[PDB]
Amino acid sequence: TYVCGDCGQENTLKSGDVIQCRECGYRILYKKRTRRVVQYEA
Amino acid sequence: GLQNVFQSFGEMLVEPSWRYATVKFGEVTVEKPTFFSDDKELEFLPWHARLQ
Ligand SMILES: [Zn+2]
């Protein structure tokens, strides 16, 4: 799952050639953070 | 600056050795930056260029 840039939409694209956002036109994608438990030492 | 630079340069007649070829430059215009995407033209911003 990948988040687009100025537009809010999940691309969810894993193809090598698929780098462009759908219905947006911009080619900047941010990787989304899933629900994973991570431990930190305070 | 650009208009003065282009106006200063003068193109003389071009002869290989009757027919002759001469070229002239008119008013120079510069458009705002844009991105030539495959779908359609899109707004271009400095951070888009930095990331891409
Ligand atoms: Zn988009």
Curated annotation (Swiss-Prot), chain A:
Keywords per UniProt: DNA-directed RNA polymerase, Metal-binding, Nucleus, Transcription, Zinc
GO molecular function: DNA binding; DNA-directed RNA polymerase activity; zinc ion binding
Subcellular location: Nucleus
Keyword match Nucleus: yes
Residue sites binding Zn(2+) per the record: C4, C7, C21, C24
A GO CC term assigned to this protein in UniProt: RNA polymerase II, core complex
Biological process annotations from GO: DNA-templated transcription
Intrachain disulfide bonds: none
Description of how the protein assembles with itself and partners: Component of the RNA polymerase II, IV and V complexes. Associates with the mediator complex. Interacts with NRPD1.
Function recorded in the entry: DNA-dependent RNA polymerase catalyzes the transcription of DNA into RNA using the four ribonucleoside triphosphates as substrates. Component of RNA polymerase II which synthesizes mRNA precursors and many functional non-coding RNAs. Pol II is the central component of the basal RNA polymerase II transcription machinery. It is composed of mobile elements that move relative to each other.
Protein family according to the UniProt entry: Belongs to the archaeal Rpo12/eukaryotic RPC10 RNA polymerase subunit family.
Protein name per UniProt: DNA-directed RNA polymerases II, IV and V subunit 12
Naturally occurring in which organism (per UniProt): Arabidopsis thaliana
Whole-protein coverage range: 9 to 50 of 51
From Swiss-Prot, chain B:
Subcellular location: Nucleus
Effects seen without this gene: Blocked in the perpetuation of CNN, CG and CNG methylation in repeated endogenous DNA. Reduction of heterochromatin association and methylation into chromocenters, coincident with decondensation and losses in cytosine methylation at pericentromeric major repeats such as 5S gene clusters and AtSN1 retroelements during interphase, independently of siRNA accumulation. Altered cell-to-cell movement of siRNA beyond the vasculature. Reduced 35S promoter homology-dependent transcriptional gene silencing (TGS) in transgenic plants.
Tissue: Mostly expressed in seedlings, flowers and roots, present ubiquitously, except in sperm cells.
Top-level taxon of the source organism: Eukaryota
Role this protein plays: DNA-dependent RNA polymerase catalyzes the transcription of DNA into RNA using the four ribonucleoside triphosphates as substrates. Second largest component of RNA polymerases IV and V which mediate short-interfering RNAs (siRNA) accumulation and subsequent RNA-directed DNA methylation-dependent (RdDM) transcriptional gene silencing (TGS) of endogenous repeated sequences, including transposable elements. Proposed to contribute to the polymerase catalytic activity and forms the polymerase active center together with the largest subunit.
Quaternary structure, from the entry: Component of the RNA polymerase IV and V complexes. Interacts with SSH1, NRPD1 and NRPE1.
Family membership noted in the UniProt record: Belongs to the RNA polymerase beta chain family.
Name of the protein described by the UniProt record: DNA-directed RNA polymerases IV and V subunit 2
Species this chain originates from: Arabidopsis thaliana
Full protein segment contained here: 63 to 124 of 1172
